[PDB]
Design a protein around this ligand. Sequence first.
Ligand SMILES: *[C@@H]1O[C@H](CO)[C@@H](O[C@@H]2O[C@H](CO)[C@@H](O)[C@H](O)[C@H]2NC(C)=O)[C@H](O)[C@H]1NC(C)=O
Lengths: 50, 49
Amino acid sequence: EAEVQIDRLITGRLQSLQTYVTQQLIRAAEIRASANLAATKMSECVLGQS
Amino acid sequence: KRVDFCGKGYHLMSFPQSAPHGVVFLHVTYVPAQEKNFTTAPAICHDGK
Ligand SMILES: *[C@@H]1O[C@H](CO)[C@@H](O[C@@H]2O[C@H](CO)[C@@H](O)[C@H](O)[C@H]2NC(C)=O)[C@H](O)[C@H]1NC(C)=O
């Protein structure tokens, strides 16, 4: 009987963990573009005159 | 003229090559060498000018 009740928790917790992992991929892809712009500004404004 | 955009040094030219799912750029740059020491001045004075 406890199998049927444990599976209901397993499904929910898996859903919640996988939602967490998707939103982190989408937030990291945005931090990546900001760091790519910072790396270009360090090259073009600090080691040069733009 | 963008620094570091086309390799390290003063960009002269670039050549493309194809790769399996990409591209390889060959960057030709100028790199200065064998520097010497000198004394400098902002301006010269001559005839009060
Ligand atoms: C231009 O002159 C400076 C100062 O004279 C040189 O600096 C030397 O740097 C070395 C580092 O290895 C120090 O040990 C010396 O004390 C410095 N002074 C000297 C040698 O007088 C510098 O090397 C010179 N630049 C060039 C390109 O020759």
